Design an enzyme around this catalytic site. Sequence first.
Site, PDB file in Angstrom:
ATOM      1  N   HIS A  73     -29.836 -21.366  41.452  1.00 22.31           N
ATOM      2  CA  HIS A  73     -28.575 -20.607  39.792  1.00 22.31           C
ATOM      3  C   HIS A  73     -29.589 -20.028  38.822  1.00 22.31           C
ATOM      4  O   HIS A  73     -28.990 -19.401  37.728  1.00 22.31           O
ATOM      5  CB  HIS A  73     -27.847 -22.088  39.168  1.00 22.31           C
ATOM      6  N   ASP A  88     -28.783 -25.229  46.282  1.00 19.67           N
ATOM      7  CA  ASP A  88     -29.022 -24.592  44.810  1.00 19.67           C
ATOM      8  C   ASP A  88     -30.658 -24.218  44.670  1.00 19.67           C
ATOM      9  O   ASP A  88     -31.049 -24.354  43.804  1.00 19.67           O
ATOM     10  CB  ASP A  88     -28.425 -25.127  43.091  1.00 19.67           C
ATOM     11  N   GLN A  97     -31.528 -29.578  30.633  1.00 21.65           N
ATOM     12  CA  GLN A  97     -31.616 -27.834  31.040  1.00 21.65           C
ATOM     13  C   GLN A  97     -33.067 -27.138  30.392  1.00 21.65           C
ATOM     14  O   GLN A  97     -34.034 -27.785  29.376  1.00 21.65           O
ATOM     15  CB  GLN A  97     -30.683 -26.910  29.537  1.00 21.65           C
ATOM     16  N   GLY A  98     -33.634 -26.106  30.966  1.00 20.37           N
ATOM     17  CA  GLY A  98     -34.872 -25.105  31.386  1.00 20.37           C
ATOM     18  C   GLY A  98     -35.588 -25.792  32.098  1.00 20.37           C
ATOM     19  O   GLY A  98     -36.584 -25.711  32.634  1.00 20.37           O
ATOM     20  N   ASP A  99     -35.178 -27.473  32.687  1.00 21.47           N
ATOM     21  CA  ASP A  99     -36.019 -27.802  33.902  1.00 21.47           C
ATOM     22  C   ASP A  99     -35.326 -26.877  35.353  1.00 21.47           C
ATOM     23  O   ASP A  99     -35.728 -27.700  36.416  1.00 21.47           O
ATOM     24  CB  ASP A  99     -35.705 -29.484  34.023  1.00 21.47           C
ATOM     25  N   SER A 100     -34.462 -26.216  35.691  1.00 19.20           N
ATOM     26  CA  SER A 100     -33.752 -26.260  36.563  1.00 19.20           C
ATOM     27  C   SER A 100     -34.354 -25.266  37.837  1.00 19.20           C
ATOM     28  O   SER A 100     -35.540 -24.401  36.864  1.00 19.20           O
ATOM     29  CB  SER A 100     -32.654 -25.561  36.324  1.00 19.20           C
TER      30      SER A 100
END
Length: 224
Positions: A41, A84, A177-180
């Site tokens: 993603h 993912d 969010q931002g760690d994905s």
Amino acid sequence: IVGGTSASAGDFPFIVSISRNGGPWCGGSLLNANTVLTAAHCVSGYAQSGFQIRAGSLSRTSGGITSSLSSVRVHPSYSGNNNDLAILKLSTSIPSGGNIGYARLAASGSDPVAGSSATVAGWGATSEGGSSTPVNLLKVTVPIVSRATCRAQYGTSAITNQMFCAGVSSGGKDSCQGDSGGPIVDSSNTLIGAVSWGNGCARPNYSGVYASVGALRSFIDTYA
Ligand SMILES: [Cl-]
Ligand SMILES: [Cl-]
Ligand SMILES: [Cl-]
């Protein structure tokens, strides 16, 4: 990272920050000199030119060694949140040495055992919906949550055999969010997953959900 602490130099020699359009975006894991593992993603269908990888630094914006992308391959069965993972090839090869190193991977067919201690790292928001992101790498340690418990949280179909979960019942410690795409490791610093998704960040009774390296090793080994 919510409820995190500062990563030390060399804690994750293989961690990369993945910037997009010059701003924070994702994390990743350096598998070898020309290859990064991230979440599908983070990259799927986006302009590849937008991305820059930085290795060998606790900062996402300075230090270490950088690279643009030459290609992006998503898991062949990537669908919604499922499977993912994506393999990025690098325009500029990045040698090991100093504070740069290559990830060792969870054994093929392994699955993190509930209650075992996992450590996850990134440059994501330190609160849910946080708009400010830290300059330096944060980490947090949280226990594995059983697939059965995670399915009780998210639903049966929501949590597949290519996902595992981690977090605390109380909330307060999680990726955000931002760690994905960034690394989650076992107690030995072996790479067990990539930050994938969840219901907000650090909420009571909603685990962080991770793409399983153990479950997706054939894809990784074929294209690394
Ligand atoms: Cl059941
Ligand atoms: Cl708890
Ligand atoms: Cl696979």
